[PDB]
Design a protein around this ligand. Structure first.
Ligand SMILES: COc1cccc([C@@H]2CCOC[C@@H]2N)c1
Length: 165
């Protein structure tokens, strides 16, 4: 069902795409959100996914946090995918702009292994401040399930592909 992806490894695929547009097109079983521990989807990928759900993701997330408390950095929760996917896997990668330990990025990607196929952004990339080349490396060395990565920025997508070892 996923189209136009470049195959990086046996299980990792990448495309220059807006993950919101990609999710609406594919309606995957799982779309990954670049979440924070409070599930406050203000900006970056989370703000864009939440805005596509007309804020239903945020309303659901606030109820989740009221019941369960915050997630751990490196952790995740499965919530509804709303109009984007069957489910949304909210994964918290470390935020370098909050001084969080980059070593938690591998733990964050391990959450992907609980799902056979996922549409995902690069964890801790963008406003999370980590090097996206490093995020892609950790992704291919950690995720064993089938991951379709959507990279919004064309220039970053080209840099990721051209530098992939
Ligand atoms: C909003 O998206 C939804 C909602 C319900 C089911 C699905 C599945 C997921 C697997 O692929 C087939 C269907 N598109 C997606």
């Amino acid at each position: 069902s996923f189209s136009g992806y470049l195959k990086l490894t046996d299980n990792v695929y990448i495309k220059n795409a807006d993950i919101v547009e990609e999710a609406k097109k594919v309606k995957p079983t799982v779309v990954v959100n670049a979440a924070n521990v409070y599930l406050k989807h203000g900006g970056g990928v989370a703000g864009a996914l939440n805005k596509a759900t007309n804020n239903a993701m945020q309303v659901e997330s606030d109820d989740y946090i009221a019941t369960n408390g915050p997630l751990k950095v490196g952790g995740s929760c499965v919530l509804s995918g709303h109009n984007l996917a069957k489910h949304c896997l909210h994964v918290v990668g470390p935020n370098v702009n909050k001084g969080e330990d980059i070593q938690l990025l591998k733990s964050a990607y391990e959450n992907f292994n609980q799902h056979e196929v996922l549409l995902a952004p690069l964890l801790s990339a963008g406003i999370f401040g980590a090097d996206p080349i490093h995020s892609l490396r950790v992704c291919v060395d950690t995720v064993r399930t089938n991951v379709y990565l959507a990279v919004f920025d064309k220039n970053l997508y080209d840099k990721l592909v051209s530098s992939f070892l």
